[PDB]
Structures are given as C-alpha cells and as structure tokens.
From a paper:
The H1 histone is present on nucleosome 2 in all four structures, and is also observed on nucleosome 4 in all cases where this nucleosome is structurally resolved. In all ten focused-refined maps, H1 shows three DNA contacts, similar to what has been described. The H1 loop L3 and the N-terminal part of helix α2 contact nucleosomal DNA near the dyad, helix α3 binds one linker DNA and loop L1 contacts the other linker DNA. H1 that is bound to nucleosome 1 always contacts entering linker DNA via its helix α3, whereas H1 on nucleosome 3 uses α3 to contact exiting linker DNA. In nucleosomes 2 and 4, the entering linker DNA is in contact with α3. We found low Δβ values at nucleosome 2 and Δβ values of less than 6° at nucleosome 4, where H1 was always observed. Stacking of nucleosomes 1 and 3 is apparently stabilized by H1 binding to nucleosome 2, because a published structure of a 3×177 trinucleosome array lacking H1 adopts a non-stacked, extended conformation.
Numbering used by the authors:
A (entry chain c), B (entry chain g): 10 to 118
C (entry chain u): 35 to 109
D (entry chain b), E (entry chain f): 20 to 102
F (entry chain a), G (entry chain e): 37 to 133
H (entry chain d), I (entry chain h): 30 to 124
Amino acid sequence: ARAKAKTRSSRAGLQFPVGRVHRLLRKGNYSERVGAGAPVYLAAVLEYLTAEILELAGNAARDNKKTRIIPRHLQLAIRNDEELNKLLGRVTIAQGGVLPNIQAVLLPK
Amino acid sequence: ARAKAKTRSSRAGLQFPVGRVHRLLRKGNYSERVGAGAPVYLAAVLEYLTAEILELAGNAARDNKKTRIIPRHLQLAIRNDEELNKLLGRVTIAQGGVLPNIQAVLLPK
Amino acid sequence: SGPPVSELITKAVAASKERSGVSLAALKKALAAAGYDVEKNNSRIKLGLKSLVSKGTLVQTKGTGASGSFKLNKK
Amino acid sequence: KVLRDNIQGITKPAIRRLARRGGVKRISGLIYEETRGVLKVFLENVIRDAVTYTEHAKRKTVTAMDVVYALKRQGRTLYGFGG
Amino acid sequence: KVLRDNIQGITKPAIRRLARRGGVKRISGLIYEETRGVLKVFLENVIRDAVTYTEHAKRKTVTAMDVVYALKRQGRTLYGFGG
Amino acid sequence: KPHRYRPGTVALREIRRYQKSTELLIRKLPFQRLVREIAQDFKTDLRFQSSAVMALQEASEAYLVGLFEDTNLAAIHAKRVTIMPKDIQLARRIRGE
Amino acid sequence: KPHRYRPGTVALREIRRYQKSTELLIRKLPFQRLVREIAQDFKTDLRFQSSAVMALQEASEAYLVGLFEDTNLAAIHAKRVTIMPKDIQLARRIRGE
Amino acid sequence: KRSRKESYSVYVYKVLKQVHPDTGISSKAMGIMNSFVNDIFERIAGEASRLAHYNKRSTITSREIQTAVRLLLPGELAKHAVSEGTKAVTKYTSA
Amino acid sequence: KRSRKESYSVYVYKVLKQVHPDTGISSKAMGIMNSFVNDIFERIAGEASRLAHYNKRSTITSREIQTAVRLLLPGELAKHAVSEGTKAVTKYTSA
DNA sequence: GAGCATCCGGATCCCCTGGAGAATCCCGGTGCCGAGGCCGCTCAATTGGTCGTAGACAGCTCTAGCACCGCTTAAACGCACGTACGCGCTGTCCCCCGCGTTTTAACCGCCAAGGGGATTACTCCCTAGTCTCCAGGCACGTGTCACATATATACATCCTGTTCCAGTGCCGGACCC
DNA sequence: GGGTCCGGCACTGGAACAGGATGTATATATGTGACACGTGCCTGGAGACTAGGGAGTAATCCCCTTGGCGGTTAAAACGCGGGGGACAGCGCGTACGTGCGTTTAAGCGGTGCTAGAGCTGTCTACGACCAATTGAGCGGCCTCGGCACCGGGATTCTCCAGGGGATCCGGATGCTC
C-alpha cells in the first residue's frame, strides 16, 4: 500500500542528491535537528555553483579547442571571474598553475 | 544519606569550572558523545594560558607602577611575547594600543 | 644651419653666474626657454658637456661625469 | 534623518593621528581620499555582514555582539564586547 | 639511513623556473638560500601538523588526507587530493 | 623670532604621544553619523546601541592602523619617508582583498 | 658568429612557457628525500603515500609561487626588476608570518 | 569486494550533461569538484551552526541557510542563489 | 526582573589572586578576558570537533584534545599545557 | 695683404629599416590508455505513522536609544613661511642571464619482500540520562581608596648663536720668456 | 716688460659647544566612582544507578609501500662573456610640517518619549525515529576515440647588418682693418 518510491531531488526539480546532503548534515553535528527546506536549499546553491564553474570550464575548454576539461581550464575559469575569485581566493588547484600575467614594466620597448 | 557535595574542579585542584565547560561542550554540539577527562584537560590548558598572560600583565603593571590591570597592560603583555603573538596574530584588543615600534630610518641623524 | 649647442651652453652658464655651478636641470630648462629640443638631445647634451669640460673651458664644481653643477673657468 | 556627506566627516587630522598610531613620519596629502575609500569599503563589508546577522534575528537594532561576530568571521577579530 | 643535506636537493634552476611561474625576470644570488629557508619553515610547519594528525590516527604512514587536512587548518586548503 | 621646531620632530613627538596613548582617537559623533549614513543604504531605519558604535570605531581604527604599519614597511621598502596611494594599494593587494 | 639573444628575452619566453603550462617544476625524488628528512627529526620510521608527498609538493610550489608574485609586486614597487631577499622579508612580514 | 567511498562524481557529470551536452571532464578535475562540494558544504554548514547557536536556535532551517548563502557568497552569486533556492523550495513544498 | 548572564569572572579573579595577591583589574579588561576564554575555548573545541568527525569517532576524547592543543599552540605553550593537563587528569582519576 | 667672421660642404655618429635564423604555431599521423557506459550488487533513501518538543506569535513591561536644547571650549581648518624630501638623470661598477660542454643522478621500468591499513569479530569501559538535592556564582547594594586630574618643579632636548676650522677665490709676488 | 704660474690671506661655508625655551617627566594634593566586598537565592552542578553503545584489541591479508638494480638522458653544474640594471650623488621643484589665528561643531549636561528588547505563556506546526523495502549509486570491467607524443612546414619574434638624417668639424670665401 506504500506509494511509488520517487526521490526528493526529483520533486525539488534538482539533480544534486538532496537526501545525501540531508544525511551529511544530520551526522555533521551542526544542530540537534534540521528543517526540511534547508538541505533542499543547500543542494540548490551547490548545484548553481557547480553549474557556474563548469559552464565557465566548458567555455574555456572550447576556447582551447578541447572537448575534455583539464584543471588548467578550471584555473582559466575561476581566476578570470573576480566574484568567484573572492569566493576562492585562498585555495589552489593541484596541477593547475597560474593565469598568464606579465607586469607592464617587464616587456621591452 | 547522600555524599557531601564536592566540585570536580576541586578534586582536580583547578580553578575554572570543569562542570560548566563540560556543559558548554555538551550544548555546543561539537560532539555527540563527550569523555570525562577532556573538560578537565581543557580547563587546565586555559588555566595555564590565563596564568601566563596575567603574570605578564602583572609585571607590565608593576613596570607602569599601577596596581590594576588596564587593557594597555594586556596589549603590551600579549604582543611582547612572540609565541602568544603567533597564537593571537589576527586580533586587536579594545583600547589596547600597540607596542612602541619606531623604525630606525624615522629617527634623526 | 643654426649655432651648435656649445655656444648656447656657454650663454647658459653665463646667464646666472651664481656662486655654485649651474646644474644640468637648470641648463636644460635654459635651453628650453631660449628654444631647443631638449627631449631628443640628452645624449647630445651629455657629449657636448663632456667635450667642453675636457677642453677646460668650463670646470666641474661637485659632481662626477654629467651629474653635478657646472661653472666657467678661471679666465 | 537623511545623511548624505558624512564620508568627509572623518577629518584630515584624524587620519594624521591614525598615521601617528601607525608610525608614519611624513604623510602625503593625496592619501586621504583613498584612505576614506578603503575605510568606507571595510565598514560597508562589516555592516553588510552585521545587517544580515540582525535581519536573521528579525531585529531592527544591531548589537555589539553582532559587530564582533561579523568581525570574527572576517578574520579581523576584536575583543571585549560580549564576544 | 639518516639524511643531512637535502635542502641543496631543491636546485638552482628549479627555483629559477618557479620564479618564472611567479613572473620574476632576473634573480639575484642571495635569493636562493632565503627561498630554501622559507620553504623549510612552511614545510616543517605543515608536516609537524600532519604527523600530529597521524599520531592521533595511531598510524605510522603519512596519508594525503591529513596533508590536505592540515593545509586546510593552516588556511591554505588544497583542491585535488581530498578523498 | 618666535620659536619653531623642524619638521618631523613635532610629528615624531606626536608618534610617541599618541602611540603611548590608549584613548579613542576619532571623533565619536561624526563617525557614528557616517556609520548611519552607510547603514540606510542596505536597510532602512536601523538603530544602534552605543557600545556597538565604539566596537565599530575600534575595529575601523585597528584596520586602519595596521594598514599604516604596512605602508610604513612599504615606504621604507621604496627608500622613502612619504607614503603614496600605490603603497596603500599594494598593501591591499598583498593582503589579498 | 653564433646567435645570442639579449638577456630577459629568453627569460620572458620561458615565463610564457611555464606559465601557459600546468606541469610540475620541482624534481620529485630530491624533494621527497627532503620530506623524509624533515619528517625524521620529529618521529622515526615514517612512511609516505606517493600521492601524499605529491600533494604536499603542489602545496609547496603553491606557497612558493604566491610568495613570488608577492615579491614581484614588491620589487616593481621599488622601481626595480631585480629581486632581493629584503623583498622576501617584506612579503613575509605583510603576509603575517 | 570492498567497503564503499561516498562521492559526488556522477552528479557533477550529469550537471555537465545539463549545461554542456558535448564536452567531457577529467578524473583529476572530478576529484577537484568533490573537494569543492565538500569545502563549500562544510563552510555553509559551519556558518549554519554558528547562526543556529547565536540566536539559541537548535533547528537548522532554510532561513539561516539563506542568510549564510547571502553572507559567504558575494553579490550576484548570493542573489541568484537566493532566487534559485527559493524557486527550488517552492517546488519542494508543492511536492 | 532580570535574566542572569553566565560568565567566568570570579574564576579569573581567583587565578589573579593566585598569581598576584595584591593586584587589581579593570572591568573592560575583564570583559577582554571573558571574551578571551570564550574565544580560545571555541578555537580548541572546534578543532576537537573537526578531529572527531575526521576519523569517524563520534566521541571527543582527551587524547584528541591533546592533539588539538599541540596543533593550535606553537612551541613551548604546548609542552607546558600537556604537562599540567596530564598531572591534572591523573589527579582527577586518583580522586 | 692677411686675420678673422661666416658660410658651406664633407666625415661621422645615431636612428631607422630589411633580411636571416630560430622558437613557437599550426597541420597531419599513430597507437594508447583514461573514460564512458554496461552490469551486478547492496544500502541508504523513502513512506508513513507517531511522539514529543520547540519556535512563532500574543501580550506586557521597561530601558536605553533617539530626539531636542543650551553652554563651552578643543579641535577643524586655512594660510603662509619654510625646510625637507621624490625623483630624474647619469656614472660607474658589478652581478647575473645565456649559451655551451661535461657530468650525474632522475626517471623509468623491472622485480622482491614485507608493514601496517584496513577491516571484522568480540566483549567490555564509559558515559548520557534522570531523579533528587544543595551550594557557588551572580544580581544587588554599598563603601572606599588607587587613580584621574590639577598644580608646582626639574630636567632633557632641540634648535640656535658663537666660535673655531677648512676651503677657496682673489690678490700679491716670483719666474720665465 | 709682459705673461703666466704659484702661494698666502681674508672672506665665507661648514662643524663643535653652551644656552634658553619648552614639553615632557616627576612630586604632591583631592575627590570619585569604579573596584571590591558582603547578601540573597536559585539554578546549575553533582551523586547514584541504569542502559546501551562506541570503542579497544586480537586477527588477517594484501596491497601498497619500501628496498634494490640497470640504462638514458634531461637536467644539473660549471665556466666565459657580456650586458642590463643597482644604486649613489646631486640638484631642483615641490609638498607637506608646523605654527599662528578662527569657526565651529563635537562634547558635555539635562530631559522627555518611545519602540524595541526582552521575558512569559500558548500551542500548533514540524522534525526525529524507526520498521520495511526498494531503485539509485558505486565497484568492476571492457571497449575506443580524444588525445599525448612524433614529425613536417609557416609564421612571428629577435637580432644584427646595411641606408638616411642630424651634427660637428674643417676648409673656402669675403670683408674690413
């Protein structure tokens, strides 16, 4: 008599695992309990952030004539957007490197 | 009928309330489950830090020949020790001021 | 044609004749005021001043090379 | 109620006195507008954090606890206001 | 078995190429030992934290998890080795 | 002729005086008015308790004074005694903001 | 007469070369020996995952390269292109270290 | 067999399918994105715990998640995250 | 009618009288110290919470408190702190 | 008739451009190995019912915060004299990139052997929970002495006069032609 | 007897030392209010017992880590050379420093009002927990085409070897004495 097992990400219209986030906050020990809307909200914001990052990453991959994204492309993505730069200023991508940046005094006349 | 009341700080021989910090760790949700010796240990650590910073402040106040601690004394105490400086680098004390720091190029001759 | 720079520099050092020598900046501004392209002739004024001090017609007060202050001879 | 031009309300000699606190020997006159700008930026950031803290609490008055709390999350911690 | 001089193992052109990655054009001679020293300080500060993590783990092997974890605590969290 | 000290010596005496001093250094009311002035823009009708205003006062003074030892290091670095706005700007840049 | 480029032109070319690159710069075996050496003075008989010492390695050039644009800004601040350890000391002092 | 390692890989892959149907992703960057999800997750979770404690609230609600999303994310990211998350929770309450 | 607010005032006063019988304090520096105890407590306790969640231990132990103290406190403070703490916990277990 | 002023043309040096080489960019080519997808499994998500409990709201008090007002100067500000740097430029010395050759140990790859990572089974030490009890810490009241403030001396310090030492330019003498 | 070269002296610039003004430090008097001590209380800490589970420890294996050995060469190391800066000095222009006066608005003291902070009581919405069960999520595995490496040809960058313009220098010319 139980209803058909559908997923909470599907009723949320989202693709990130909402139930897994709910579980990880439940055992993360950040409060004694969590409301229903909070893991949905956090899965939503994580999905938007990952969509932004990989949209810029795919555009950078098409920039480099490549259909496969390298962490170098993640550097070209995040380090060329100042708002994401403020989001992730203190982090470093392994095997990523730095953007090409030359000070104006360095080039010859 | 029942045992005579004796606080656990006294049985430890320590001054900060081990029961209070134990309760505060219980309601901070920093763990589900809390061991017995950890609040005693934490209390002893905080007593040593307070003891050293107050003896530094007391020698600073005796240097300034004032009997009572002013936050200027506390700033001079916390900043004249390199190791507490490493422990408390990114903090400023209210009404603290700063250490006497004048660079040699600023001095005449 | 036009007179070369050396006569202009002799007039520049004779224009003020204060107790110390005339400086490089003062002679450049004197050439600018009298009328000269000082912008593209820095190597020119350097070689000219070195050439004239090598003859002894003008003597160096304090500096070394092109730096310092410049004043005319004993006579 | 309306305030418009209190960004110049911090005086030039006040910035000189903070420079004396910082150990500045000679201060340029061109410094003052950019110090006012970075001062306004830092205050804008911290009170943005503070007003989000208080509108979480459904309060129309901000407290000193919220101030030291916002400065705690920025990495410029202060002490002595109930923190 | 024991090791005494591995700070010379971080060689001169490698430091040079790192300075190219930093965009540095020309590098003086006195640079090299200073970079060796600050490298030594940063490495010892992180590896002490890591070995305390392993001693908490009761584990005689340094794992990538505790390296990422200690760099996270030291404010320099690293992407690409978690998990 | 009336007495006059040479430049910097009065400034250095001010350094010793004010760095020895511990009191609040900026004027209270105009800074408080400025905090309100910035405050209307994000949320209307915000009210302040006074101790919060002194806390913001000390926070602003601390952030500024730290930037000024930073720019003093920069001015010594460029062999100067004057700071210029690029000194402050590069202090901001190396601090990572 | 063999060709010889003016100095810095080559240097700018390998700046562009490794800066568009993404690969490792420091040799992994002498550095890994250094990691065992610095681990040795605290506890004996330590073992290292290869990925662990690699991750510590990109952490190493990460901190080093970040300190290097810090010192590069410090060096161009003083109207110079030559780097000196006094710039490194400046960068460490502003960084809080 | 073995005990499992929980991950966020195929979710990043299917979001890639949503935003860019043609391109691919390397395993190294995939581990980077698992680290990214864990890092932003723990930051938002920690700020949620602080905002819960600070009002003496012991329930994680959607509201302080909204405040912390505003608080950590700068500007445009924050406002678009609020819009998209409110859209998501309105669909969630509507089953 | 008021609500009592918890603090650590008399305990720091007792510590002062143990280290200096004849010295006083200001109330402002007293607020500095109460906030100091709270802040250092929050740092150490947050480190302990992280160390608990890392190795899948649901119980905070004095051992990982010791690791956290050796972690956050550099140099000489760590070895002193572990010294009084070990003798203190042995005194606690002895009575 | 020749000494000097002037003009004009030729050597020379700096700037200004074309060509050779070379490092990288771009176009094929090949075989390879990470990746994407099938498949099997199994575990955490889901439903649903209950149970407790916690925050949202209504209402009521009361507190300091906002507003207004009147003196009262400390400071904000402006201006002017003045001195102390910022930096522009160049001279000079020197230190470090660049390119080549020789060396060397790094990388790879190939193979052996075992140390502890990690997982499982067990059984037990330890600690939340709860009821009850009672005493230390905090609101509250008060009293009181170190400290803020004011006032009278004393000394450092900092700039300046004054006084002596050194450079130097001009004047006097001596030599040489 | 003139021209030139050298030495001295007095005038001026630049250091050593005493002296006055002043700000800063020190000594002494005075009230005050914040530090400190005593009281009431009541809640937060503690003693005992119980349940239950997280975790310490034996065992095992395996696999991933460490040790060793041969080959190649890319990278390190060293040397020559040459060139680009580092930096000191000097000077000039300027840009604040500071010291006077002036305006004012911050600061202080006093008062009314209120709106929100905050505390208490309701109670309803909502989240936690748990039996049962399933479908998505991950390990394993297997193929393949995007891609890393390899090679060949253009293009752009660099640097250096020839031409043009400005300049300086020397010779011709006229003029005037």
